[PDB]
Amino acid sequence: GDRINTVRGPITISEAGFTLTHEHICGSSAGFLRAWPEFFGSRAALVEKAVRGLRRARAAGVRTIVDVSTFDIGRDVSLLAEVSRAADVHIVAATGLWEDPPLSMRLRSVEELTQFFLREIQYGIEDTGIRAGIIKVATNGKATPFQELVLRAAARASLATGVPVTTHTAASQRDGEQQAAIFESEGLSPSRVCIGHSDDTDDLSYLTALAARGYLIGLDGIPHSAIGLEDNASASALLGNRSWQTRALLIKALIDQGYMKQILVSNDWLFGFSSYVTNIMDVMDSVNPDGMAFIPLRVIPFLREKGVSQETLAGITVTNPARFLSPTLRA
Amino acid sequence: GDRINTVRGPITISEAGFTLTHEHICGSSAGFLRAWPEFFGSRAALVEKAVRGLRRARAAGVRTIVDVSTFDIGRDVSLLAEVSRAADVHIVAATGLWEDPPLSMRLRSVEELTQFFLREIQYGIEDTGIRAGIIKVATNGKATPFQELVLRAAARASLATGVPVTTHTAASQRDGEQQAAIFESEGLSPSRVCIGHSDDTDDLSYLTALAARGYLIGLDGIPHSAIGLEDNASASALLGNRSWQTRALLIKALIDQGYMKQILVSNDWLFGFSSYVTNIMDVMDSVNPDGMAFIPLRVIPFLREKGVSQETLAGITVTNPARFLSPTLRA
Numbered sequence: 020g021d022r023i024n025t026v027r028g029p030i031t032i033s034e035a036g037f038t039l040t041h042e043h044i045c046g047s048s049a050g051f052l053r054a055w056p057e058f059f060g061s062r063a064a065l066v067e068k069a070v071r072g073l074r075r076a077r078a079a080g081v082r083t084i085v086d087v088s089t090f091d092i093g094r095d096v097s098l099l100a101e102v103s104r105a106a107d108v109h110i111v112a113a114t115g116l117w118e119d120p121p122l123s124m125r126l127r128s129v130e131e132l133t134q135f136f137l138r139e140i141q142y143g144i145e146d147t148g149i150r151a152g153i154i155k156v157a158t159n160g161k162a163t164p165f166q167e168l169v170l171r172a173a174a175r176a177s178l179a180t181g182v183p184v185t186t187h188t189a190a191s192q193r194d195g196e197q198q199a200a201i202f203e204s205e206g207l208s209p210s211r212v213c214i215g216h217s218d219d220t221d222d223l224s225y226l227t228a229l230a231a232r233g234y235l236i237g238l239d240g241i242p243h244s245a246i247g248l249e250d251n252a253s254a255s256a257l258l259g260n261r262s263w264q265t266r267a268l269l270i271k272a273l274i275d276q277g278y279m280k281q282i283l284v285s286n287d288w289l290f291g292f293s294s295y296v297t298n299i300m301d302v303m304d305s306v307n308p309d310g311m312a313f314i315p316l317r318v319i320p321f322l323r324e325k326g327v328s329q330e331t332l333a334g335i336t337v338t339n340p341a342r343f344l345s346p347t348l349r350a
Numbered sequence: 351g352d353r354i355n356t357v358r359g360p361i362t363i364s365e366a367g368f369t370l371t372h373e374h375i376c377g378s379s380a381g382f383l384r385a386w387p388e389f390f391g392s393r394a395a396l397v398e399k400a401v402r403g404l405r406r407a408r409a410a411g412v413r414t415i416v417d418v419s420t421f422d423i424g425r426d427v428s429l430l431a432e433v434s435r436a437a438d439v440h441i442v443a444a445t446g447l448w449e450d451p452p453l454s455m456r457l458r459s460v461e462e463l464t465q466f467f468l469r470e471i472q473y474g475i476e477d478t479g480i481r482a483g484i485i486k487v488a489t490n491g492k493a494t495p496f497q498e499l500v501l502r503a504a505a506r507a508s509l510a511t512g513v514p515v516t517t518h519t520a521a522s523q524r525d526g527e528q529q530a531a532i533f534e535s536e537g538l539s540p541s542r543v544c545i546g547h548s549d550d551t552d553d554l555s556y557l558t559a560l561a562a563r564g565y566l567i568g569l570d571g572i573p574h575s576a577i578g579l580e581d582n583a584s585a586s587a588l589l590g591n592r593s594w595q596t597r598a599l600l601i602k603a604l605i606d607q608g609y610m611k612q613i614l615v616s617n618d619w620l621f622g623f624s625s626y627v628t629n630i631m632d633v634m635d636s637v638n639p640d641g642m643a644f645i646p647l648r649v650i651p652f653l654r655e656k657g658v659s660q661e662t663l664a665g666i667t668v669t670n671p672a673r674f675l676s677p678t679l680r681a
């Protein structure tokens with residue numbers, strides 16, 4: 020309630036400022052950057068690209084990003100700390116598990132997983148001493164048996180520490196409904212949970228049913244769109260064919276329904292991406308050259324033109340992330 | 351043809367001596383030991399157990415083990431080097447991919463995979479400078495599309511370097527037949543390939559069909575048996591219900607069919623095992639307290655009693671591994 024853990028140590032709530040709540044320095048796999056840095060050109064090339072991108076985001080007003088890369092996204096907190104220092108942008112790191120856990124995770128019990136998540140929140144990630152400030156989980160449709168354990172362990176870790184949970188969904192399958200059911204069965208307050216990738220759907224009944232019971236709604240992929248690349252099957256499968264304007268208008272829709280305090284907005288951008296097809300990063304950068312600066316440079320002015328106030332947008336980009344991230348059992 | 355790469359540098363062929371060709375210091379997942387060492391008690395506890403085990407194996411006559419842990423078994427070559435130094439046992443490290451590759455590997459092309467395997471053989475693993483001396487691959491039944499790429503890339507890496515290939519099979523599904531077909535389609539000599547876990551089957555037609563075309567036969571799980579633990583479903587699923595004597599007699603069978611020069615024998619032991627059920631290591635150590643010393647302390651005397659000569663067993667445990675491991679396009 021007074022401090023948020025970043026990769027450079029605790030910061031005060033007021034220090035977080037304008038915060039992107041779902042981003043990645045690098046979307047990869049555990050051990051991969053260490054074993055095959057040439058996949059990204061070089062580790063130094065990846066660092067340089069990330070620092071340039073974060074510096075441009077800072078110039079556009081961003082002060083903090085939440086890197087929601089887990090163990091199995093290949094989160095490298097030493098890389099995050101290096102990039103954070105060079106760009107003067109706070110980075111909050113994550114624990115949890117995404118959609119690609121290895122056997123040594125997939126075989127674990129709910130108690131074992133809770134110990135692992137608590138390790139990364141309360142003690143440190145690997146031998147770095149850097150502590151996670153958020154817990155990331157994932158489903159893609161109906162939860163697998165192991166994913167049910169992950170969601171329950173995430174709830175237990177959050178209940179012990181006050182650190183929030185943020186989720187990956189297949190939004191068009193309404194995953195948030197089952198995620199909410201499992202979280203609530205463990206006693207977790209919806210005020211500690213962001214149901215993410217929720218801008219992947221236009222179903223207002225699904226989105227308002229989550230918001231009505233107190234969940235935060237992660238509209239976190241605004242620039243993801245393959246409009247202009249129908250020839251590219253893999254880019255279309257990843258990014259979808261809805262426009263960024265269509266995604267951004269969901270922010271206005273939820274404001275107009277009274278949920279402005281529960282909206283979290285982000286780009287879900289990356290500076291490297293080995294867990295998808297080769298050269299996807301080049302395709303993505305062609306779609307959105309602004310990178311993580313897309314939200315402040317393009318989405319905020321778009322919503323202002325559509326009649327959203329500056330005050331409301333400041334509440335969504337500053338006040339809501341601080342309330343979400345500040346450790347508490349009830350926000 | 352003059353040197354084998356180990357985790358402590360090149361060694362001469364004569365230095366390898368008595369060699370176990372399929373072992374693991376730790377069966378885990380990429381990044382896992384770094385992120386959650388408490389799973390093994392501690393990293394220091396794992397090191398200590400491995401050093402004690404390898405020292406007892408050395409006292410029984412072992413001079414070299416081939417650790418066939420890949421990237422996705424969580425191979426940590428710095429751990430291997432530490433254990434090798436302390437126990438005075440050479441350790442050959444592996445490249446390749448086993449049955450649990452992450453997305454950042456599963457999405458790669460045959461050319462990309464060949465670059466990665468060549469990196470670990472020709473340049474070094476991670477930033478350690480330690481070079482792999484063998485390429486490990488896997489199927490469990492019919493090869494997945496990606497596993498076909500892995501087998502082809504393994505063949506290409508072996509054809510460029512002379513380093514051999516060793517495989518994981520579902521032996522009762524006769525995987526070696528498809529593996530051989532794919533290897534031969536890339537032009538790889540069977541003399542550079544060991545079809546492993548072949549002691550998991552009693553099918554002599556399958557085993558002699560591989561040996562007849564020149565493959566080495568990996569009878570590498572001799573002490574794996576759950577005879578005595580039918581109450582334990584997970585141990586029975588892993589270890590099977592055939593006795594170690596039944597597995598060991600396949601060595602004699604292949605000798606009696608004229609294949610003594612193509613047999614490779616090992617324990618497929620480990621000192622930690624996070625990629626299976628919790629406490630499996632305790633169950634395994636109860637079944638086989640000799641660990642990696644099981645082959646020299648129990649299998650060699652058993653075969654001598656069954657009438658196999660000391661000379662023949664020395665050829666299988668010293669001559670065959672040296673011929674297999676010494677880099678060449680044709681052995």
Ligand SMILES: *[C@H]1CC[C@@](C)(CC)CC1
Pocket residue numbers: 274326327328329330331332
């Ligand atoms: C933020 C302020 C409230 C409105 C104008 C809705 C009354 C939305 C923008």
Ligand SMILES: *[C@H]1CC[C@@](C)(CC)CC1
Pocket residue numbers: 605657658659660661662663
């Ligand atoms: C090794 C020597 C050859 C035999 C005796 C078969 C003639 C097997 C043991």
Ligand SMILES: [Zn+2]
Pocket residue numbers: 187188216
């Ligand atoms: Zn996601």
Ligand SMILES: [Zn+2]
Pocket residue numbers: 041042043087287
């Ligand atoms: Zn993401």
Ligand SMILES: [Zn+2]
Pocket residue numbers: 518519547
């Ligand atoms: Zn195997």
Ligand SMILES: [Zn+2]
Pocket residue numbers: 372373374418618
């Ligand atoms: Zn093995």
